[PDB]
Amino acid sequence: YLLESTMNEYIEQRKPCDTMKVGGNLDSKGYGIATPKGSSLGTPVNLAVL
Amino acid sequence: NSIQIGGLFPRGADQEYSAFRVGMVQFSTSEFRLTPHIDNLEVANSFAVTNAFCSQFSRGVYAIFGFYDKKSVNTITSFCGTLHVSFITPSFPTDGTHPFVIQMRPDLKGALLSLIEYYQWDKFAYLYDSDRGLSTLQAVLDSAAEKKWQVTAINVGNINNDKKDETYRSLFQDLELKKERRVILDCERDKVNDIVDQVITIGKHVKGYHYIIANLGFTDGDLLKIQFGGAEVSGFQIVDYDDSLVSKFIERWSTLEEKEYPGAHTATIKYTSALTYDAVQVMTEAFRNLRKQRIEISRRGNAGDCLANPAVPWGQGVEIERALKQVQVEGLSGNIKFDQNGKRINYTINIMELKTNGPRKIGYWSEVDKMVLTEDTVVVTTILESPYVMMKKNHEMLEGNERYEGYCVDLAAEIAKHCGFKYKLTIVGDGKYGARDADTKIWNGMVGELVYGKADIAIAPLTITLVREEVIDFSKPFMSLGISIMI
Amino acid sequence: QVTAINVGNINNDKKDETYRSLFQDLELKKERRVILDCERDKVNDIVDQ
Amino acid sequence: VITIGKHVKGYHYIIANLGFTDGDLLKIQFGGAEVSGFQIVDYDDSLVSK
């Protein structure tokens, strides 16, 4: 079952312990806050994220 | 019908004396006349209060308007209990149940106590003055025990002008060793303007400090000199200029003549002189109501002296105060409603706070209700995933918005408060992360709330893709990741 | 750390409910040291309580 | 400087002219910000004191 990396990493440290992350990353994706297009909050968020 | 009353005014109480005559001209009616017979005195000398009291009682009056002080208040409240002569006054409220005394000043101590929990204070100082009694001090020392405060109350009144500046440095150098950021000032005008001039000179009005000027004139004293400092200054005021009846007065008040009325041509009026104008309405309202009930109380029998053995009252004095307590009119401060005691009830006190544009109004206070915070966001769409958003074991136990926790939940709370908002997490439990569907192009899950405008912010482990980027804006990536195999 | 409490306004009807009221509030803090600034009529009233 | 409250500790000023005690200086004596300056007329000299 292919999925997100740190989601796969969390189940490996949680203790049913029968899961395994093998190989490495196969892509690069980003976890960003979804804001409206032309957001009322995004430009304050964009620095406060950074 | 020339009703004769008496006046006991302090020496140098100029604006109250002008505000006395303003009501005498306006609230003069065609059907009766009020005879002032004003005397001038020094109000702290209880000899001088006494022979000025017995002079007017030798003249014969129906009521007496005048001021008292702390060093003369029991000379007043004893005589008005004895000779049954009612006494209307704007001074500080006497503690107890005193007959024949009309306090025109509202109480303060409930509003002052209500303000402190609004700022949620635990440790503060309290600079008080002895001139207005110790009633406000005794209330907050009663309140500091049961509600866990650390009140460092310091008397400040006994300071001579030759050594003011040496003392106030020595005052506030003590508070820095205590690291006090919060101060309640509890004084009249002059001791506020002295202390604020000493706060500025040592530089103790920058951001990080907070002050509460605990009297009824917040805009009364000079306030420009700490308007731009950085320390937030709160306060209390009963005379709201946004009211029309006040505005009708001020436009009359500003136009007056200086040598005819000293201190009249101003933009603001002080609360002490404001109640002075308010009482002449109340004094006039009684003798309207008295003849309307047709209780002729013309005691033309000679009053004699005050040193009678035994001193005898006159039972038409009992008639007067019942009319004085049963008056509900409107004036500059608001609803003037009395008790059986002589104290005011059903009144409003405007909690005002000082911003850089000036005094604003963040609400009002009452007896029935506390500080009424008369003022004048984002909706988080997400999904619960471990350890981003997690459903707590204290689901039914812990209520509110800490019912979900996790890594995303901290970062959502970090991103709302550094921007300024407060979060509203509501999870659509459809389970689908959401994308632009085939053949119908409906955003399914969290994007179904976000693109269609049913939510504002979405703090979630969501992937920024090309067709994701087109419809709605994104932030920067939280972390760098990839597709990973799980076996 | 002074806790100053007015005991002056206590009246004769409500003595055993009010003199019991503040000492438990002292006992909710465990105050151990008391100064009495009263006259002997109020002092012997307090010592009885 | 005083009215906006910018003479607390953390600040420093240098009044760059030849009269340092010439202007009014009491109003920032007790602030917290260190104020330096320049003066040519020393009153500790006898001929000045005369």
UniProtKB/Swiss-Prot annotation, chain D:
Organism name: Rattus norvegicus
Domain notes from UniProt: The M4 transmembrane segment mediates tetramerization and is required for cell surface expression.
Tissue-specificity statement: Detected in forebrain. Detected in dendrites of neuronal cells. Expressed in the pyramidal cell layers of CA1 and CA3 and in the granule cell layer of the dentate gyrus.
Modified how: Palmitoylated. Depalmitoylated upon L-glutamate stimulation. Ubiquitinated by RNF167, leading to its degradation.
Additional record remark: The postsynaptic actions of L-glutamate are mediated by a variety of receptors that are named according to their selective agonists. This receptor binds AMPA (quisqualate) > L-glutamate > kainate.
Residues with glycosylation annotation: E34
Upregulating conditions: Down-regulated in the pyramidal cell layer of CA1 in the hippocampus by global ischemia.
Oligomeric form and interacting partners: Homotetramer or heterotetramer of pore-forming glutamate receptor subunits. Tetramers may be formed by the dimerization of dimers. May interact with MPP4. Forms a ternary complex with GRIP1 and CSPG4. Interacts with ATAD1 in an ATP-dependent manner. ATAD1-catalyzed ATP hydrolysis disrupts binding to ATAD1 and to GRIP1 and leads to AMPAR complex disassembly. Interacts with GRIP2. Interacts with GRIP1. Interacts with NSF via its C-terminus. Interacts with CACNG2, PICK1 and GRIP2. Interacts with GRIA1 and SYNDIG1. Part of a complex containing GRIA2, NSF and NAPA and/or NAPB.
Protein name per UniProt: Glutamate receptor 2
Compartments, record wording: Cell membrane; Postsynaptic cell membrane; Postsynaptic density membrane
Entry's family note: Belongs to the glutamate-gated ion channel (TC 1.A.10.1) family. GRIA2 subfamily.
Role: Ionotropic glutamate receptor that functions as a ligand-gated cation channel, gated by L-glutamate and glutamatergic agonists such as alpha-amino-3-hydroxy-5-methyl-4-isoxazolepropionic acid (AMPA), quisqualic acid, and kainic acid. L-glutamate acts as an excitatory neurotransmitter at many synapses in the central nervous system and plays an important role in fast excitatory synaptic transmission.
